[PDB]
Each structure stands twice: as C-alpha cells, then as structure tokens.
Amino acid sequence: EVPTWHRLSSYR
Amino acid sequence: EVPTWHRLSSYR
Amino acid sequence: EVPTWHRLSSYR
Amino acid sequence: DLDLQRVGARLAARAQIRDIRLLRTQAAVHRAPKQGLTYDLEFEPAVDADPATISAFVVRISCHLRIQNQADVATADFEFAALFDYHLQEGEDDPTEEELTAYAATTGRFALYPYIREYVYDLTGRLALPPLTLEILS
Amino acid sequence: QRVGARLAARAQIRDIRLLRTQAAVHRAPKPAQGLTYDLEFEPAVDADPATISAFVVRISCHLRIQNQATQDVATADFEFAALFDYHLEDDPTEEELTAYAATTGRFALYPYIREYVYDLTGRLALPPLTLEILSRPM
Amino acid sequence: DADDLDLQRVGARLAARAQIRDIRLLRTQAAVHRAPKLTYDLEFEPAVDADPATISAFVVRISCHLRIQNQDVATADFEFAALFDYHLQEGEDDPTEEELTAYAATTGRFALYPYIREYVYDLTGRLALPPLTLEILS
Amino acid sequence: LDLQRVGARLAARAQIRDIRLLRTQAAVHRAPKPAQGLTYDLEFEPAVDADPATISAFVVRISCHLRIQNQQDVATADFEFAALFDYHLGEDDPTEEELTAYAATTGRFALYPYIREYVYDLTGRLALPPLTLEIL
Ligand SMILES: [Ca+2]
Ligand SMILES: [Ca+2]
Ligand SMILES: [Ca+2]
C-alpha cells in the first residue's frame, strides 16, 4: 500500500 | 438572545 | 530528588 | 469574595460548564525582556443571560495583561466566554441578575481561570518571552 | 478540599512542562461509521518536604482513538508536570500533597492536556479532538 | 506563480551565507463576529529589516490577514518574524535590498509558513470555530 | 547536483498535497541548567512508499532522531513525517531511482520546514528554550 490519507475540512 | 454556540465534533 | 526544573528568568 | 460567593451559591449548585471560547485577542511585544520579570493582570466579568427564555448563560471575562522588567515589555487585551447550562428544580424561580453577576465574579471566574492561564502561557511562549504561568487564584 | 486547604493557602504555581510523549496513527479514521475515544488519567505528586519546599504534580494520560461499529486508529501516552512551591510552622504531609494534587493540581493541568490533544490530533491529520471542559466544585 | 525561481537566483548568494536563529510571533489581533454555520481568504505581506552597515543580521517578517465567512465570521491579523545571521568572508559585499527581499520571499516565506499554518489551526480552535488547516504551499 | 538531475523528470510532474506527523516519541531526561548553552544532533532518513502500476501518487517519509545536550542527554525525540505527492503522466512510470532521488532531494526539502516547526513546538513544551533547526 501507498499509505495515502485525506484530511477532512469544513472549508472551501 | 444569549450568544450560545455549538462546537462541531466528529467524535461521539 | 524532586524532579524540579528551572528557567533563567522568572516572574516571581 | 465570600459575600459574592454567598449570593451566587444557588447557581453553583444548579449550573454546569458546557464550553469555553476565546472571543477576541490583541497582543504585541514592545521591548526585549532584560533582572527578573513581572506581570499585571486586571479582569472584568460580565454575564449574558435571558432566564425567561433559556436556561443557559454565558460568563465573559475581559483581561488586560502587562508584562514588565522588575526595576512595558508586552501587552495583551483578550476576552473569554464560558457557556453554562443550569437546571432548576420544579417550581424554583429563575436566577436573578444579582445571582448571575455574583456567580460570574466568583465561580465563573474560577472555572475560566485555568484556561486563561493556559492561553497566557501559550501566547507569551509564542511571542518568545519566558512562558508566563499565571499565579494561583486565591 | 479540607485535607488540602492548608497547603492551598500557602502554595504557589511556578511552571508547567511536558515530560514525555509517544503517539502513532495506525489506520484511517471513519467518522461516518462512528469515531470515538478513551482517555485514562493517572495523577502523582513528587515531594520531599523536609529538604525543599517545592513539589511537582504529574498527570500521566493514555489516549485511544477508535473506529466504532471497535478498531484503534491512534494512541498516545504522555505526561504533564506542574511545579509548585510554598512558604511555611509544620511541613505538608503526604495526604495534604495528594489532596492538593487531586484538586488544584489536576485542574491547573487539565487545560494543557486538552490543548495538547487538540494539537496532536491535528498534526496526525485526524479529525481534531477537543476534550470536554471539566466541571470543578467551585 | 512562476516568478519564484528568479527570486531563488537573486537570493542564492545570501542563502549560501545566512543562518536562521529564531522565530517568533510579534503581534496578533483576532475576533469572532458571528456564528459559524465555511470559506476563508488569507493574505501575506513579507518584509525585511536590515542595516548591513551596523549588524550582519536581519529579520524576515510576514504579516497575515485572515478572513473567515459563511458561503464575516472571524478575522485575524498577525505577524511572524524570523531572525537570520550572516557571515561575510574576507572580500564580500553586503547584501543588497534585492538579495534581502528575494531571500525573504523564498527561504523566509517557506521557513515561516509552517508556523503560520500552526497558528491558524490553534487560533480557530480557541475561537471555537471549525479548525482550519491551511493547504501546504508548493 | 546529481540526484537533482535524476529526480527532475518526476519533479516536473509532481505536486505536494499534504504533510502529516505519523509517530513521535520524546522525553526530557535531565532538566537543562537555566541559560547554559544547549547543543543538538539531528539524524534524518528519507524513505518512499510507491506503487506506480496501481497509483500515480507516493508518500515521502522522513524519520528523525533528535538528541539535545548541554554544551548526558538533556532530551531526545524520535518521530516521522509523511508528505503525500500526486503525479500526472505515453510517458513511462517513474522508476525506483527517480522516486528515491526525488525523496532525498525535493521530498526532504519540502518536509524540512515542517520538521523545523515541530521541533520548535516540542522543545518549547518540554520547557527548553525553543530550538530553531538550521537551514537545510
Ligand atoms: Ca438548561
Ligand atoms: Ca553576523
Ligand atoms: Ca495521480
């Protein structure tokens, strides 16, 4: 696995 | 009109 | 020994 | 102290802290810390409540901090809010303005003070001063 | 409260530090499945009142962040310390030190613990965990 | 965008001789105005302090203005500084304003950005807003 | 110079997406005497996680070992940062040489400022004078 991630945000 | 707020959380 | 630690400065 | 404590004591029994937030802050470092340091912290309490419509209230503490050399190095002006819920017994009358202000000066203050301490310590460290740990609230 | 009132009138807070920390993210969080946490605290006091009139309150913490519905997403073990001294008249006893640590000590340190959890979880790229504001009897 | 690699050529002489000593917050102001139910805009303004005929050292400052809105909620105005030292060999000339301003816009900016990002994160938390984590600069 | 060249084809097509701390371990073992000079040793090692046949993205990890002493350790820390890069490609996959090359050069360089801010923050929390790591 390439240990990627996604960070959650309430912003745009 | 009390300036209350709610902090959002992803945790239970 | 009590594990104290000390700064150069202090506000006392 | 004890007389305000008296007056806000029914509130101490019915109320519980829900949350805190910083409402505003302003700070600058003016001059280098040299000798030993000292500080001055003045506070003013306020309370926002509407007991006829909601059984929660907000305690606000405004603060003026001055840091100095023992013989101004830095100043900060900031305000914290703490939100409280209260729960009356059936038939109990609403808190009055005087219970609310008394509580805000005493238990409100006491609840907030350790958070104020952590904020001040963080802010002073960031400004690259010796981190300040506020004295115990007597 | 009573057991530590005597030391509470004579003790002054001096500083706070992190002693140690260890943490790791093990897996992706899943808020939508349900994300939760466990936080165990262990208080301790270090003193030797016949030789020095200073003591240290330590709180050891174990944080476990978990996916529900019960898989571990991250874990941390860290410990904060608070340094106090006092001006005596009879030396404080182990009971007095323990009660003071359990009350003033614990509640002084709690905001630093909460800020650290918030900072760490942000750095690990987890949803930021903001601990609850802990109530204290006035 | 792409004008940045020219600035790396113009600051390279100084970049080869400069060394970072310290970073600090110089000032901050911030307030929450209205409820979060978000977007943001963040403006930077670099600046350099030097006087390369008294001292062989200079300071890179970056002033930040942050605005948060619902699709204003909160505003912040703060400045960070980094302190650099340099050493000139037997012949060398002093850095000019062009080399100082180019090093500031590149090495200075990239060195400061993590601190700004962390301050933003901490500040939105203390204001009880959804925590804002800025994107990584390329 | 050399690795800059080997990494440049990947460097021209890759963009940084995010940086995070993966793990940390640190302790203050002996309080520093106030204002007596502190020295540091930082060891880093880059590693790269990639599977170009499956995913056109990779993670650069820099692991760090930090020793602080008085001018016998005062404090130590062991931690690892990750940088997530995304790339766009009849061009070939990047080879393990282009990736390792990028990781020890551009990857290290993009991570280093964040390593500096973490060390500053962490040394300050340990009640040490905050350390500002030297320029890379
Ligand atoms: Ca209520
Ligand atoms: Ca110089
Ligand atoms: Ca891709």
Numbering used by the authors:
A (entry chain F), B (entry chain E), C (entry chain G): 104 to 115
D (entry chain A): 9 to 42, 45 to 81, 97 to 163
E (entry chain C): 13 to 81, 95 to 113, 117 to 166
F (entry chain B): 6 to 42, 47 to 80, 97 to 163
G (entry chain D): 10 to 80, 96 to 113, 116 to 162
Give the exact sentences the study uses for this entry.
The human pathogen Mycobacterium tuberculosis possesses such a TA-associated SecB chaperone, named Mtb-SecBTA, which specifically controls the Mtb-HigB1 (toxin)-HigA1 (antitoxin) TA pair. In this case, the ChAD extension is specifically recognized by the Mtb-SecBTA chaperone, which protects it from both aggregation and degradation.
To investigate the SecB substrate-binding property, we have solved the structure of Mtb-SecBTA together with the short C-terminal fragment of the Mtb-HigA1 antitoxin (named ChAD), which was found as the main site of interaction with the chaperone, both in vivo and in vitro. Two subunits associate through their β1 strands to form β-dimers (A–B and C–D), resulting in an eight-stranded antiparallel β-sheet. Three Ca2+ ions were localized based on electronic density and geometric criteria, and calcium binding occurs in subunits A, B, and D at the same position. Binding occurs on the thinner side of the Mtb-SecBTA chaperone tetramer. On one side, two peptides (chains E and F) are bound in a symmetrical way (related by a twofold axis) and adopt strictly the same extended conformation with a rmsd of 0.6 Å based on main-chain atoms. The third peptide (chain G) binds on the opposite side and also adopts an extended conformation identical from residues 104–108 (rmsd of 0.5 Å on backbone atoms) but differs in main-chain (φ,ψ) angles from residues 109–114 (rmsd of 2.1 Å). Each bound peptide makes contact with three protein subunits in a similar way, with some variations.
